[PDB]
Structures are given as structure tokens and as C-alpha cells.
């Protein structure tokens, strides 16, 4: 469905997604300052995971977070489309 976010701290969030593909090698998480020349940061979680922790965020700053499913049928390229949201911590 959608990408869910919960703020764990002004520097850290917990993002969650709905397992739609059954045969996923891993999910790829990328996050970066919403509108920013700075390259994106990224990591992975096993295809069994539907949640991930992102910390080290600048508080109050808008970040673009996207999650890519990499299926077992693929060597690296992800399934399309990825799911994404824009989020800033603090409220």
C-alpha cells in the first residue's frame, strides 16, 4: 500500500512497508535530504523484513525515503515501482 513512518527521536525514524511481493531477496532503503546535491544514503534489510530504522537525520529537515524490492529473480535491479515518502522529524 504505502510507506509508513514513525519518529523514534528527532534524529531517527522507523519506516514500514507492506510485503506485496512474496519472493524478495532484500529490500533496499535509500534516504537523502529532500532536494539536495548531496548523494543519497542507502542500506538493505532481508526480504523477510517489513520495517527499518533510519537514524542520523538532521532534525526538522525534509528527507526523501524510498524502498526498493529486489526479487529473487533478479541479480540487482529492483521491482518497479518503488515506494517513497517525504518526511521531516519534529512536529
Amino acid at each position: 500500500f504505502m510507506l509508513e513512518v514513525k519518529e523514534a527521536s528527532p534524529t531517527s525514524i522507523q519506516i514500514s512497508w507492506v510485503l506485496h511481493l512474496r519472493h524478495v531477496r532484500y529490500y533496499r532503503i535509500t534516504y537523502g535530504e529532500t532536494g539536495g546535491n548531496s548523494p543519497v544514503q542507502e542500506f538493505t534489510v532481508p526480504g523477510s523484513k517489513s520495517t527499518a530504522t533510519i537514524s542520523g537525520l538532521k532534525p526538522g529537515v525534509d528527507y526523501t525515503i524510498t524502498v526498493y524490492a529486489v526479487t529473487i529473480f533478479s541479480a540487482y535491479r529492483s521491482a518497479w515501482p518503488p515506494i517513497s515518502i517525504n518526511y521531516r522529524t519534529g512536529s
Binding site: H20, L21, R22, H23, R25, T44, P46, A69, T71, I72, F73, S74, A75, Y76, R77, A79, W80, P81
Partner: protein, 181 residues
Amino acid sequence: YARPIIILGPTKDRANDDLLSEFPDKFGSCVPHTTRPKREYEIDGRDYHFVSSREKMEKDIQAHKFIEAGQYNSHLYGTSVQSVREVAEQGKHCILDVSANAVRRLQAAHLHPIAIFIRPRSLENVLEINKRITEEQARKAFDRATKLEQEFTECFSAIVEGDSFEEIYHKVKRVIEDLSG
């Protein structure tokens, strides 16, 4: 011997996924190669074949041992001819998520692939068969499918259409059975 499968076009990821879940004795997936170091949760021989010598994978690539390979994040990744052949020789259709360019490479390896293109009838049709995307995304998928058909029609074993994903999937299943003799 089971012919490996490449499904391309809108909803191909859902088709790949449901084929394996619904007929796990007739379909399988192969284990790709990478030169990136293994992650703690990964298992050699299951997630990837973790190649120690980048130079070794490079020779294999130049020797045409991979039906598809590239560099991503300074590491090499490929789907190998042998890995596909190993699945097919178990009598399982190897479900592949690869570029259309790989179809030729499979034919050169005498692997006799089945390639099926899902053709959207229109932009509206994209939204009929994929009810999980925006109209903005549907037009991207429509544009890409158009360009896919224009470049790779000769590689397709079949082109299938439908007013719903159920109709697409029914045709995909029937085509694979027919081509499986």
C-alpha cells in the same frame, strides 16, 4: 528440460511472483553472482555465489558466461549461463528478471528461452491491469512498454493483452504450458 522464462512489460513482477507461488514444482529461480562481500544475513550458494576474485568474474564475463552482468556500487553482479542451466535441468522453468537483451544471450547458450511481452492496449488499460499505481506512473510504464515493443518484438515468443491482470495471467500460464512440450 524446462525452458526458462522472461516475462516483460507492465505487471511482469506480479506475474513472476504468482507463477512461483502457484506452481512451485514447475518454476524456480537461479542464484546470481556478485563480487561484493557477503552480508552477515546472506548465505553463499543461496542468496548469491560470492566471488572472491573480481578478476575471476571479469574473465567469465568476457568469456560470455553471463546472460546479463553489470557494475553497481563498484561491485559486479551477473546471472550466469550455468546457474540458469542448473535450474532448467531440474525440469523447472527458470523465472528471470533480466533485460530483453538477455533473450539473445540465452538463445546463443542453446537454452531456448520463452519470452512473453505483456502489451498494454492504452494508457487507460495500464490502469485496468495495474490497480496499484498512479496515472503519472502508468504513463511512464506505458511509454516504456511502447519502446520495449518497438525494439524487441522479434525476441518475444508471445505477446499477450487483457482488460485485467487476471486475463493477462491466464494467458501467460496458457502460453507457458503450450510452449513446454
